[PDB]
Design a protein around this ligand. Structure first.
Ligand code: N6I
Length: 110
């Protein structure tokens, strides 16, 4: 059941990275580059950064013991965005749209 669950998780990650969702997913493809984005305090506020490329690296590396560990990293990526940004920020709206996809797919895991 454990490897079966992670294969389903790997499929969620594929979907989140697919062109269908790119209009809102793209800000989450890569780690936040605080210098390049001029968010120079980002790592003072966000102590555990996360992004979809890091989830992929960890999934490929078999670092997730279960689907719950996968889900916690994905929710950490959304919560970092809700924590750092003002609630009316463009990127918060994009995070919510992507989280709507994640939560639905994750809940439908057989
Ligand atoms: C530009 C900018 C300004 C500020 N200010 C903080 C102080 O309060 C006023 C606002 C916070 C930001 N947070 C992020 C951010 C990301 N950005 C990608 C960027 O390519 C991007 C992509 C889509 C829309 C936008 Cl608007 C920017 C990606 C993931 N998580 C993030 O949190 N960008 C911010």
């Amino acid at each position: 059941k454990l490897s079966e669950h992670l294969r389903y998780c790997d499929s969620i990650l594929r979907e989140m990275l697919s062109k269908k969702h790119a209009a809102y997913a793209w800000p989450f493809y890569k780690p936040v580059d605080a210098e390049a984005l001029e968010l120079h305090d980002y790592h003072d506020i966000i102590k555990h950064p996360m992004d979809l490329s890091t989830v992929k690296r960890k999934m490929d590396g078999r670092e997730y013991p279960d689907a719950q560990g996968f889900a916690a990293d994905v929710r950490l990526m959304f919560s970092n965005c809700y924590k750092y940004n003002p609630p009316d920020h463009e990127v918060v709206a994009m995070a919510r749209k992507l989280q709507d996809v994640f939560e639905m797919r994750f809940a439908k895991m057989p």
